[PDB]
Design a protein around this nucleic acid. Sequence first.
RNA 1: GGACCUGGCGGUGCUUCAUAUCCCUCUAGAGGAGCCUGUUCUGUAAUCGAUAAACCCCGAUCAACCUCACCACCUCUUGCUCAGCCUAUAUACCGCCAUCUUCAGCAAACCCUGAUGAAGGCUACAAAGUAAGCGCAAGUACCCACGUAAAGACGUUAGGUCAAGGUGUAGCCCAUGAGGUGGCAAGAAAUGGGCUACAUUUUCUACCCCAGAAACGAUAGCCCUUAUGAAAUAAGGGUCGAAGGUGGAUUUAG
Lengths: 320, 201, 132, 304
Amino acid sequence: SFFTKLTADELWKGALAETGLNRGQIIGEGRYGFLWPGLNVPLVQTIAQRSKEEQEKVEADMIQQREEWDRKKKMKVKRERGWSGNSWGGISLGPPDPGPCGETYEDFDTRILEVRNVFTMTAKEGRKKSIRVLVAVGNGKGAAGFSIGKATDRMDAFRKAKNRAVHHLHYIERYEDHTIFHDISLRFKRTHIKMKKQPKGYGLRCHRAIITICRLIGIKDMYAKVSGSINMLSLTQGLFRGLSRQETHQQLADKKGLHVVEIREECGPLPIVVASPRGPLRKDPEPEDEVPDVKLDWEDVKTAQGMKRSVWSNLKRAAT
Amino acid sequence: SRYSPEFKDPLIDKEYYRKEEKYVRELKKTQLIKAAPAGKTSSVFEDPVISKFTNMMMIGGNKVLARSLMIQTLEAVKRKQFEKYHAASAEEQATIERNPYTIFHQALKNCEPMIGLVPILKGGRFYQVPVPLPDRRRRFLAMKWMITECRDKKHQRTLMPEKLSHKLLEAFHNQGPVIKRKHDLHKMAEANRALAHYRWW
Amino acid sequence: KNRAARVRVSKGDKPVTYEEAHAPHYIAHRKGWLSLHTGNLDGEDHAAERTVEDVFLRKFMWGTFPGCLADQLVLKRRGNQLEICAVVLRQLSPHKYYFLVGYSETLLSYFYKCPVRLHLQTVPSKVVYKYL
Amino acid sequence: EDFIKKQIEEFNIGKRHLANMMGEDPETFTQEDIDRAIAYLFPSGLFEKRARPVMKHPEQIFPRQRAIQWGEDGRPFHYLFYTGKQSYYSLMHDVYGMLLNLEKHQRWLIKEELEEMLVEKLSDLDYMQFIRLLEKLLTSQCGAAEEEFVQRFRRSVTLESKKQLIEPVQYDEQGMAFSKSEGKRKTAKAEAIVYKHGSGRIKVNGIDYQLYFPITQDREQLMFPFHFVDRLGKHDVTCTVSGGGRSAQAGAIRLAMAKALCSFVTEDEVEWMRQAGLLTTDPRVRERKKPGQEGARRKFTWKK
RNA sequence: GGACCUGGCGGUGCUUCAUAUCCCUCUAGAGGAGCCUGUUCUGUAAUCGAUAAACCCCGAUCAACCUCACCACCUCUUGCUCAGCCUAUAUACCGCCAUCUUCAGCAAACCCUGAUGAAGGCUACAAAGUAAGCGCAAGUACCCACGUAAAGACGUUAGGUCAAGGUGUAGCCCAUGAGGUGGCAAGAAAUGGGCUACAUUUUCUACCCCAGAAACGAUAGCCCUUAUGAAAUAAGGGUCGAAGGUGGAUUUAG
Ligand SMILES: C[NH+](C)c1cc(NC(=O)CNC(C)(C)C)c(O)c2c1C[C@H]1C[C@H]3[C@H]([NH+](C)C)C(O)=C(C(N)=O)C(=O)[C@@]3(O)C(O)=C1C2=O
Ligand SMILES: [Mg+2]
Ligand SMILES: [Mg+2]
Ligand SMILES: [Mg+2]
Ligand SMILES: [Mg+2]
Ligand SMILES: [Mg+2]
Ligand SMILES: [Mg+2]
Ligand SMILES: [Mg+2]
């Protein structure tokens, strides 16, 4: 009965059952086609009725528009893969949201690194799902920073994470804007990261997270082996600790009072002065400590002498 | 309660309302007095003990019946005491007392107990322990004992004024089942003397 | 819990008006009645067909003014003047509004056999009393 | 704000229209007349007086929007800006300074009222510390600026006087003096008339008290005021009563005699008799049965 | 496996309370008898749903037919309907509610702490918290500011109803749909809740509380009459003169 009919909001609420589609209609269309002057056609003042061929053509046009609307529901959207499909580690969120103090972050790229579904226990509800995300934001000029965003919604966690990262940025010194100054050995809690400066064209032979972070920073030619616990949140933090605690050539020259020179095998015996002291020059030479007391790494010595027999080390991979 | 807490009690005493407590009088004339109940009256024929005893004899809100029963009751008490006076001799007339209010009061004061028995659970078995009773509790106990003995159902066709008059005269002369049960309470306290250390208050 | 006419709080983004914001216990403490007919007053006989005509008119108006009535209607009934007061939005074309006004006018006139008056009020957007 | 300015302009033009609307083309249309006029124009019928229609000026309609605390250079105006509670902390500073210079020389506001005066949210303990500071200033012997400071922080008391309202003695009928009083208790209404002299004569509903009240409790209830005031066989009461039962009628009648003998007794004795509790209506009335219960407060069986 | 975080538990400690809820206490009842009415079980060819607190005079502010969806028998095919179905799924739902709640918490958006883990954020003589919004509160109704109502968020129990209606999924259309007539609601028994009693403060009569007289108890069974109805359940009168002697453990309410 017309009286026991009920609204579509209630009907779709009951049908979808999400709590535990009439836009393709003009105002005067019916199947009999008694088209009026006030509706459908505008206001000659003549009442009329269309023919059967016009009615069937109009309803065929309406139906084919309906299957067109169904197709424009079911296209396929292209999501760029991050480290794998159905993952989040290389997914590019957009530029960071513009700050309320007239601030724009347009050269800054944000990359997710880790999305975890994290539960806690509450007295009434039970298990309470909270998404914790970790993102890194950087522009390819040295400034980068990571942050954690925790929420009940993934989008809210993303937004919180990227805004807190642009408020917590670092700066990374680079040798010739392609690599680090030296080799950095750093243990952060239980994550040992061993990184080496590499010459141009070496590429980013690093852990996939390190590749994303160093693409956000601007570094291009580094080796990086991580060991111990490969925890994502400790990996990023230890990497940023080391990259912010680099010692540059100018600081080395000022500290030692000596010239800093480079000898490349590509050029030859030509000495290239890279960093000179900005003050006085120290005149007694550097003490040549014969048989120096340094702490070597057995993996490095194994690789140098060639007993590192592995079927995984120098494998042919894709670009960076 | 339909009274706000600022409403206080009304007090009715002519010796107080005829004349330290001067600031008490001032605060009382500045504070709110609630209305007087129906049972209390400014009269001085009345007894608060008698009124409470009527209110305890009341069943179902029949104050007219409770009053009528006490009417007939100490009416009969006065009648029988006058019979004793008329049938007595000189010194017996000198020693007999026929004021039913005084007989009622003295019967209740003879009927009231001085110690009580409270159950206390030490371990897993209940122990009846002696206890000091408050004055309100012992007066209520005496009056309830008299009423229960009147309604013991062993009286058959006897009427309530006759029952209460007979038990009242026995209680005044220090006999009867109410004095017997007070003595039995003291007997059972004597039985369990040494359990009195179980009290913590 | 009472779920009679109380819209629940989602998280803070739900536009809602005075009517369906207020709960049925404020029915004339704060809200008032949407339909004024004297049928439900103590001496009267015809209140049942008054009510079935009320629900008929409300569903008829919701169905023949499609997607333009902002919130619910004001159905007044004085003498034999039935008055339908509407709060309709400003999104269609005014010739269409006048067309449906006359249409509803004389349809309800010949259905309820009384002078029926459509009194319209146009609003730009759905009014928001609070956000729930 | 421009919102406030054009709202004030709209209110002025609207109240001008509204006075012209009703009857009042003269310029002086006061607020109570505005309320009466809008009450007639839109008959409210809503139980909430804030849900009733209103015509006030936008100062009272709109809340107090606090002004901008800094200009177009930063540089906030008050020196105590970065506390975030500039008015409260400036007040604390001023009272403390007034205590300091006073020492070197030698009812209360509520938290909501102080919040209104400061236009700042306040804590209970902050308000308590302010009150203790002002109490210290009052206990210290202070000068007139201090006194007017305490008095602009202090408000009125609105004390009530509680002498029983003495009904007038109307000298009427033939030559006799009387008072006509009323009483109500438990759905029973009793209006009584006491003449000063007559040695004690009661006329409940045209008959005597031993006929309308066969119960000695009811007769005692009638006796009660005369026996309290020691004027037993001196007056006469003719009373008519509607509704109730025997004790409700007796109590209502008693309240009527008490509230007329108040007129026929001295003021000290009527204060004494009010203290005795005869001039106050007993508000104890029958309660309501509830759905799902078996009486007013009595419930059904097993629930635990 | 080691160490934690949060929550729940503890026949877990200290301290402070509850007051008709915790005990001692106060009053009146249940559980013992009869009757009424639900439920279990048995029975019938004979609906369904509720079923610790939060079922058990519950859907029903109510079944002789009707209601009715049950059964028996006999009939209807574009069937009141551009059919319908009281077919299953309350673990798809909306709808309207119970319970904690005789609570005060829930919290968008931020910020900080924890080497940037799960998480956490307390000291007014103040050590990192700020808060829109919901709720309590406040404001309303009744006779007051008191009291009683109403109100009580997020969530808990996949808590109750696809049978109030709507409805997604699966099914039927010779059927599981539609109509007509007639029956279904009986106790070897048990149990929940009410009503009346077992009398003397009682019973009958007048009075509606100053008398007279006794010295008990079915609203059950049977008969007659009446009300309504097509067709008796209810009412009155007659008849009869049950069991019953104030009810253990336990328990309800104020
Ligand atoms: C058997 N359990 C797993 C169960 C299953 C379902 N539903 C299904 O799995 C069926 N799903 C299909 C039919 C295939 C669609 C269920 O739907 C249910 C339940 C539990 C019951 C228990 C009910 C019970 N009462 C009715 C006797 C009970 O005592 C309680 C209780 N806590 O008091 C319940 O939890 C219970 O009422 C209930 O709600 C159940 C289910 O809902
Ligand atoms: Mg894939
Ligand atoms: Mg079920
Ligand atoms: Mg069927
Ligand atoms: Mg409830
Ligand atoms: Mg309630
Ligand atoms: Mg409230
Ligand atoms: Mg369940």
